[PDB]
Amino acid sequence: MSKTTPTKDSIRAEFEELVEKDSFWSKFVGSQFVSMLTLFITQIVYRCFQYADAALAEGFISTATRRSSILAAAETNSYVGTKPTPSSGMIEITATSEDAPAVIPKNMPLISDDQYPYMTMDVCRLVDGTGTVEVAQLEIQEVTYTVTAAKEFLEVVLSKALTAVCYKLEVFVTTDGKTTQWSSSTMFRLAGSKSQVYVEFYKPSEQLGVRFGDGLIGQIPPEGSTITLKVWCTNGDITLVAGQNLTPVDSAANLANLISVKTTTPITAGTDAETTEITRNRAQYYLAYDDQVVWGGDYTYFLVRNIPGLSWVKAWGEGQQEKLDGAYNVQNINKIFISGWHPNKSQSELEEMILAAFKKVPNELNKKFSYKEVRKLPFKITITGRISASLTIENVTDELKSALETKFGRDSTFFDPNRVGKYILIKKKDVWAFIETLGYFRDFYLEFVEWNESNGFYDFVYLDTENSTFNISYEEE
Amino acid sequence: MSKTTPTKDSIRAEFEELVEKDSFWSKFVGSQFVSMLTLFITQIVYRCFQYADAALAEGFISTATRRSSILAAAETNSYVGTKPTPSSGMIEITATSEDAPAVIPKNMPLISDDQYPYMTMDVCRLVDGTGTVEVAQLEIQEVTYTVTAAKEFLEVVLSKALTAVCYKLEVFVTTDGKTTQWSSSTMFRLAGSKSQVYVEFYKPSEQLGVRFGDGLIGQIPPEGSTITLKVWCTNGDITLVAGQNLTPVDSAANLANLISVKTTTPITAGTDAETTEITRNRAQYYLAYDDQVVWGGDYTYFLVRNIPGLSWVKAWGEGQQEKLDGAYNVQNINKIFISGWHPNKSQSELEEMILAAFKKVPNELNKKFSYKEVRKLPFKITITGRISASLTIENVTDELKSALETKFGRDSTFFDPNRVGKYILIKKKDVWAFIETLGYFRDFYLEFVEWNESNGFYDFVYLDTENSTFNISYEEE
Amino acid sequence: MSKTTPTKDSIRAEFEELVEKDSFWSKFVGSQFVSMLTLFITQIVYRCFQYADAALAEGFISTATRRSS
Amino acid sequence: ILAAAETNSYVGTKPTPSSGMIEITATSEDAPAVIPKNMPLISDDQYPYMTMDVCRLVDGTGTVEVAQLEIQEVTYTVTAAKEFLEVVLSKALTAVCYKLEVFVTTDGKTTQWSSSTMFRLAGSKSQVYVEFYKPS
Amino acid sequence: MQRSWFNHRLTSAKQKSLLYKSLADLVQSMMDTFVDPWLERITNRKSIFSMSKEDLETRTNELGQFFTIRTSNSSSVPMLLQQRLDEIHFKGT
Amino acid sequence: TRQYPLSRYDDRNIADPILRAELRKEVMLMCESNDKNLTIYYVLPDEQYRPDLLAYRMWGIAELRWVVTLAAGLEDESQGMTVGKKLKLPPATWIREMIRHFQYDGQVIGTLSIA
């Protein structure tokens, strides 16, 4: 009849009136074994219904919480995540021998004391044998294959062993000795008949794959040619304490014993792989994004995807800014308001990252962007009430302060819990709901000292946890 | 402490070595003479020893395995195990001739194909030769006893078969043509001659019987007076399928050809004898159902468990009234005020049922109990804000009102959720948390109007759902 | 998240041990009676389970192999 | 004696942990000044000890009372239907047991059940259980 | 959704038996009432037009209620979402 | 005693529906491939209810039932499949080996180039 959850007694009932209305037991009365048989099949059907509920949960990406199902849905959406980035530190180099050149050539390998591969991002220069350089945890892999048969949509597969550390990909097609670095456009967009184009994708078993053209749309590599996959890999945010020496290896091992390298800065600015839930959320928001850079939500989503580390971003369109300003400003025409907050970068820094990002991104047409600094709006909270006397008041106060900092702190994830460009603010209802979810106090009251309502453009309202007031008492039990 | 005795081969060995003392009989050892006499003495001592051991083992409550042992334990615990009960049901009765009497009385047997006696319990009225009467597999086995002596708690036991199938018992003390009925009564109370009846008894010979008491515990029948024991016996669970014909006998033997008995209504669902260990456990734990009430909380719990549909019940003794009043009361001396709510009952009804239960449970000493009025304290909630346009304001209002009346309304179950005899005050935080869990809010703000605070003793605080103000709008442009 | 169910021989084993509750029918185990009824219930539950599994599998775009799918 | 006591429906008392008073001085800056609740510890005489509360360090220095406490857990799954569901324990753990906690997880919902002796104040569906000794 | 489905791996005498048809049709009814509607909903989910209501508004509100039209033309909901999804390539106009 | 019920044949030994899905994917690829190491045999009229009946006769094991079910694409055994359809079965040990690899080290699956 229905998919509503039944009850075992209801099933036993339906069975028993079915039995009694059936005439065969009427001719054969005295089957008290069918009683516990009905019981057993009732638990069987209950387990079956639980399985059906699991089927419903897995039949929807929103309801399914499995990495595999989420990846399958994301690939249907034709969306893929972001790779982890290397962590870079700042090091000093003092050669111990005169024969060592003061100019270290580009991309010399290095090993760390914690046995991690590191690579220079540029040419190191020694000022009379003394120099300084930034080096990140970077390593090299390469796979070469040769085409042997002719299939439309040439396909290449990768192994998780290397995709777990992959950060950057390079595709070379060597046809009859001529090697060309091919470009990639997703979903074969702007792909002509013979376009050097390929599409890369995930696969629910965490596989990585790439597909080539049909000749009609996308160039088909010829038979007998070779394909080269260069993979710049990293282990993520590998952080190491400063003040330790570095050992060159491989071809650099010759100068390893001739040159001394000592780090001066802890290795920072590394990112790791993003979580399953955030991948699911970005998958839904990319389904909204519709594989096109058109609107401000898409802009924010792309920018947050391309710039890790920012707390949140906000942007407003030409019409929105003009409505705010109350004028039909021609200067504001084709001008997009932007702003953002970063837990570690200033507003000017954020503005210059975003300006550089828009500069090196050519996916725009006469699109002018105006940045304004994000203005913080701290406010205090006075929580007054009585609590259970069984816990130490100091411990309760510390726990409350930690929870408030975690939830509605200056750099709290609450502002961007979805990481898809949807910046949200704090609400009095939200605060009271959070504290009720805590539920430690029996009765309580919140005073919102210097409470303000954000404009939504750049105002950054957050709780002043350290100046917050805790009129905590013990409620009689 | 503990007891020990050496094994058989041992006792044989030391016995032969000690009989080896006299040289004239010492060397008979090794012969079948000494071995036979030795095995004889060892077997007799084995019997006495380990049968004393078995007796002391069975002397314990949980060690009883024999049916007789466990029934003796139950008799000592003043409990009777659940005996098998025959299935009862309806049977059709048709007349095969005009000589068939239209009236068939109760107390007549019916003989099955296995001569299973089917007692009738009603009067069968043949309507146009068709009649019905309640029929169940039972028999009445009648024995008698003559008063041998006027011994207090004189023992009168039955046979093994009677003890096995004694489903019901009837004791008729007949003196010189005057018959009275005596039953088995336990849980003796009140001074003087409580009753003039017998008491139960069991004997580890798998026998059940009665004890004729003296003094104020029953009375002894006069010597020569008869005691008729009519035992309702059966075979346990009885299966009766429609589609069979009976063979009435005795006074109805001549009626068998005149009256046909046809099985039309199936008769099943009889009971049998359950396992020994579970019978022992039931006997040893049935004492929980004893009306042992020792505190006002026990009173409230028992009233809750005895009267379904109570919103809540809670008592408040002299100390509770004292702390309610904040001062000494000349009247609040050993006086306990009991309050409660029932949606289907008024305060007068609640007091009436409370008093009736007080009479039904005679467990009190030097404390008076009165009924305290319950004062309704409604309060309104004004929610103000806007919802998404995807929602319907009227439907949301209806759903919220229904949920609030269900959870925190005037007829909610929140007062005593666990049905243990407790009353829990409705709190503003609780109500707002309930509505947040309901989650039909987008941006709203709540105010409480006419917050009639309740002491928690007898005042009935509840949300005025009907009069609640719902300024619900749509989160429009 | 994910769904699991015990294997055929397993479900047979716990099914027989739970039907072994009543002493008057506990001991039909080991007989072709109980084995046939057990294989019947296991076949029907296998059909429903695995065919639902196949349906949810075919519900995906790249998993379609049938011409109709 | 235990058999007679169980007939009386009486049980004894478990041994209690011995608690001492200790000082804590972190040797590294990364160590938090607030030690979370119930952090494990071993003594020099190889005995498990457990904090009864959250330890706080005043600039890396704190003091706390810690008792000889340890943790065990057993999980079972109901497979058949018997009246008076029964669970048995081993002396290996009852020789050191001090506190008991009973959780019933039905279809993913875990409830801490209460215990009332001899089923006192036990309704039809009361989350109640009775614990007892056994002469062995 | 199965008629006499237990008529194939059963001997004919036990098929015409009194109680075997009772057990067979009771379990057929039980599966009909508590397994099949899941099969019907998954088969509906297979087709964009066949999807049951619950599935339709489920797919609707997975993204959010701000991306849809509050219409009562439930038969049109499948095509309306079809156009709403195939327009993404031409929805700058 | 020490006893546990299990059987090392079930393709559904892998608890992941998605993994089971690509497993049935490549087995379908091979089955409706025209490889010579496949069996060459048509349909039997009674296979409508019992597709695995042929599996029992030519192998003695019912583990091939899901194989033939995916080969025929049946919605239910109540419905029948046309008699005479081309049916192909690979050697069972080959499936045993592939699943063994896939549930110990079924990681690369597609192609391993170099360590």
Q: How close A433 comes to chain B (CA, Å)?
A: 7
How far is the C-alpha of A263 from the C-alpha of A114, rounded, in Å?
13
Residues sharing a CB contact under 8 Å with residue B294, sequence separation 6 or more, in sequence order = B363
Answer for the pair B454, B393: CB distance below 8 angstroms, yes or no: no
- Interchain pair C17, D79: CB under 8 A: yes
A–D interface: beta-carbon pairs under 8 A: 11
Residues sharing a CB contact under 8 Å with residue D47, sequence separation 6 or more, in sequence order = D68
The CA dihedral of F69, F70, F73, F79, to the nearest 10 degrees, is 10
- Interchain pair D53, A394: CB under 8 A: no
Element (H, E) at B377: strand B375-387
Cβ atoms within 10 Å, residue A14: 19
Helix C32-58 vs helix F17-31: crossing angle, to nearest 10: 90
How many angstroms separate the Cα of A421 from the Cα of each of A295, A359, A412, A458, A461?
A: 12, 20, 15, 14, 17
F7 touches chain C (CB under 8 A): yes
Residue with tokens 């219904």: A49
E26 touches chain A (CB under 8 A): yes
Answer for the pair B20, B26: CB distance below 8 angstroms, yes or no: yes
What residues pair up with B132 in beta bridges, in sequence order?
B92
Cβ atoms within 10 Å, residue B115: 11
Give me Rg for the CA atoms of chain F.
Answer: 16
> Quick one: which of A50, A441, A113 has its CA closest to A263?
A113
Residues of chain E positioned with their CB less than 8 A from the CB of B474: none
- Interchain pair A54, C25: CB under 8 A: no
Q: Do the two chains C and A touch, given a threshold of 8 Å on CB pairs and at least 3 pairs?
A: yes
What residues pair up with A254 in beta bridges, in sequence order?
none
Q: How close C12 comes to chain D (CA, Å)?
A: 13
* Partner residue facing C59 (CB), from E27, E31, E46: E46
Q: How close F4 comes to chain C (CA, Å)?
A: 8
- Interchain pair A205, F110: CB under 8 A: no
How far is the C-alpha of A165 from the C-alpha of E88, rounded, in Å?
34
Vertex D116: Cα angle to D114 and D119 (nearest 5): 120
Among chain A residues, the shortest Cα distance to B425 is held by: A442
Q: How close A48 comes to chain C (CA, Å)?
A: 8
Answer for the pair B318, B332: CB distance below 8 angstroms, yes or no: yes
Residue with tokens 């008290």: A32
Q: In what order do the strands lie in the sheet with A312-316?
A: A312-316, A335-341, A368-371
3-state SS, residue D38: coil
Q: Which chains touch F (3 or more CB pairs under 8 A)?
A: A, C, E
Among chain F residues, the shortest Cα distance to A71 is held by: F18
Copy the structure tokens of residue C59: 């519900």
Residues sharing a CB contact under 8 Å with residue B147, sequence separation 6 or more, in sequence order = B154, B212, B220, B221, B222, B223, B224, B225, B227
How far is the C-alpha of B156 from the C-alpha of A165, rounded, in Å?
92
A9 touches chain D (CB under 8 A): no
Residue type (1 letter), B64: A
Residues of chain C positioned with their CB less than 8 A from the CB of D81: 21
Copy the structure tokens of residue D100: 């008991």
Among chain C residues, the shortest Cα distance to E35 is held by: C48
Strands D19-25 and D61-67: antiparallel
Output the DSSP codes for B437-475. HHT--SEEEEEEES-----SSSEEEEE-STT-EEEEEE-
Strands A166-175 and A178-181: antiparallel
* Partner residue facing A44 (CB), from C45, C52, C60: C45
User: What are the phi and psi torsion angles at B229 (to 5°)?
Assistant: -115, 110
Side-chain half-sphere CA neighbours of B359 within 13 A: 5
Copy the structure tokens of residue A341: 């907050």
Residue with tokens 């948390």: B433
F17 touches chain A (CB under 8 A): yes
Element (H, E) at B76: helix B67-76
Q: In what order do the strands lie in the sheet with A139-146?
A: A139-146, A226-233, A166-175, A178-181
Side-chain half-sphere CA neighbours of F46 within 13 A: 7
Residues sharing a CB contact under 8 Å with residue F16, sequence separation 6 or more, in sequence order = A68, C2
Output the DSSP codes for A157-212. EE-HHHHTTEEEEEEEEEETTEEEE-EE-GGGTT--TT--EEEEEEETTTEEEEE-
* Partner residue facing B288 (CB), from D7, D83, D120: D120
How many angstroms separate the Cα of D68 from the Cα of each of B96, D49, D51, D71, D99?
A: 88, 4, 9, 11, 13
Side-chain half-sphere CA neighbours of B155 within 13 A: 7
Residues sharing a CB contact under 8 Å with residue A442, sequence separation 6 or more, in sequence order = A385, A386, A387, A388, A475
B266 touches chain A (CB under 8 A): yes
- Write a three-state SS string for A67-92: HHHHHHHHHHCCCCCCCCCCCEEEEE
Alpha helices by DSSP H, A290-346: 296-306, 318-325
Copy the structure tokens of residue D63: 């003091």
How far is the C-alpha of F12 from the C-alpha of F10, rounded, in Å?
5
3-state SS, residue A398: helix
B8 touches chain A (CB under 8 A): no
How far is the C-alpha of E53 from the C-alpha of D78, rounded, in Å?
39
Vertex A130: Cα angle to A126 and A133 (nearest 5): 65
What residues pair up with A337 in beta bridges, in sequence order?
A316, A370
Q: Which chains touch B (3 or more CB pairs under 8 A)?
A: A, D, E
Alpha helices by DSSP H, chain F: 17-31, 52-59, 65-72, 92-105
D79 touches chain C (CB under 8 A): yes
User: What are the phi and psi torsion angles at A207 (to 5°)?
Assistant: -70, 160
The CA dihedral of E2, E4, E8, E10, to the nearest 10 degrees, is 130
Q: How close C18 comes to chain D (CA, Å)?
A: 6
Copy the structure tokens of residue B416: 């005593």
Among chain A residues, the shortest Cα distance to E61 is held by: A62
A–C interface: beta-carbon pairs under 8 A: 44
Answer for the pair A258, A97: CB distance below 8 angstroms, yes or no: yes
Alpha helices by DSSP H, B347-463: 347-360, 393-408, 428-438
Q: Which of A157, A211, A229 to substitute to test the interface with F, most F CBs within 10 Å?
A: A157
Among chain B residues, the shortest Cα distance to E71 is held by: B390
Copy the structure tokens of residue A424: 């949200």
Q: How close E93 comes to chain C (CA, Å)?
A: 30
How many angstroms separate the Cα of F44 from the Cα of each of A145, E68, F36, F47, F68?
A: 46, 52, 22, 5, 13
Cβ atoms within 10 Å, residue D90: 9
A367 touches chain B (CB under 8 A): no
Answer for the pair D66, D50: CB distance below 8 angstroms, yes or no: yes
How far is the C-alpha of D111 from the C-alpha of D40, rounded, in Å?
26
Per the rule left: phi > 0, alpha: psi between -120 and 50, beta: everything else, B91 is beta
How far is the C-alpha of C35 from the C-alpha of C9, rounded, in Å?
11
A286-294 long-range Cβ contacts below 8 angstroms, 24+ apart: A286/A74, A286/A77, A286/A79, A287/A77, A287/A79, A287/E63, A288/E63, A288/E67, A290/E88, A290/E91, A291/A78, A291/A186, A291/A187, A291/A189, A291/E88, A292/E88, A292/E89, A292/E92, A293/A363, A293/A364, A294/E91, A294/E92
* Partner residue facing C65 (CB), from F12, F20, F28: F28
> Quick one: which of B147, B225, B230 has its CA closest to B179?
B225
C66 touches chain A (CB under 8 A): no
Strands A155-158 and A109-111: unpaired
Q: How close D108 comes to chain A (CA, Å)?
A: 12
Q: How close E73 comes to chain A (CA, Å)?
A: 24
Answer for the pair D118, B287: CB distance below 8 angstroms, yes or no: yes
* Partner residue facing B241 (CB), from A29, A428, A443: A29
Residue type (1 letter), B320: Q
> Quick one: which of A245, A250, A264, A248 has its CA closest to A88?
A264
Q: How close D136 comes to chain A (CA, Å)?
A: 36
Structure solved via: cryo-EM
Cβ atoms within 10 Å, residue F82: 9
- Interchain pair E9, F76: CB under 8 A: no
How many angstroms separate the Cα of F63 from the Cα of each of F15, F34, F92, F100?
A: 17, 22, 9, 15
Distance of CA A154 to the CA centre of its chain: 30
Copy the structure tokens of residue A470: 């805790």
Element (H, E) at B89: strand B88-95
Start-to-end C-alpha separation, chain F = 45
Copy the structure tokens of residue F60: 């003695």
Answer for the pair D135, D6: CB distance below 8 angstroms, yes or no: yes
Residue with tokens 């020490």: F2
Residues sharing a CB contact under 8 Å with residue E24, sequence separation 6 or more, in sequence order = E4, E5, E6
Residue with tokens 């014993």: A257
* Partner residue facing D84 (CB), from B281, B287, B292: B281
Cβ atoms within 10 Å, residue A54: 20
Q: How close E2 comes to chain F (CA, Å)?
A: 7
- Interchain pair A205, F113: CB under 8 A: no
Copy the structure tokens of residue A442: 């029996």
How far is the C-alpha of A131 from the C-alpha of A337, rounded, in Å?
42
3-state SS, residue D42: strand
Q: Which chains touch C (3 or more CB pairs under 8 A)?
A: A, D, E, F
Answer for the pair B267, B88: CB distance below 8 angstroms, yes or no: yes
Strands B226-233 and B139-146: antiparallel
Q: What is the resolution of this structure in A?
A: 6.0
Q: How close F107 comes to chain A (CA, Å)?
A: 7
Give me the residues of E, 7-36, that contact F with CB < 8 A.
Answer: 8-9
* Partner residue facing A72 (CB), from F18, F112, F113: F18
Answer for the pair F87, F71: CB distance below 8 angstroms, yes or no: yes
Answer for the pair A89, A262: CB distance below 8 angstroms, yes or no: no
Answer for the pair A272, A62: CB distance below 8 angstroms, yes or no: no
Copy the structure tokens of residue A83: 């790779």
3-state SS, residue B47: helix
Task: Report helix, strand and coil shares of chain A as percent, to nearest 5.
Answer: 30, 30, 40
What residues pair up with A104 in beta bridges, in sequence order?
A124
State the sign of the Cα–Cα–Cα–Cα dihedral A452, A453, A455, A457. Answer: positive
* Partner residue facing F108 (CB), from A58, A159, A204: A159
Strands B375-387 and B469-474: parallel
3-state SS, residue A371: strand
Residues sharing a CB contact under 8 Å with residue B100, sequence separation 6 or more, in sequence order = B126, B129, B255, B258, B259
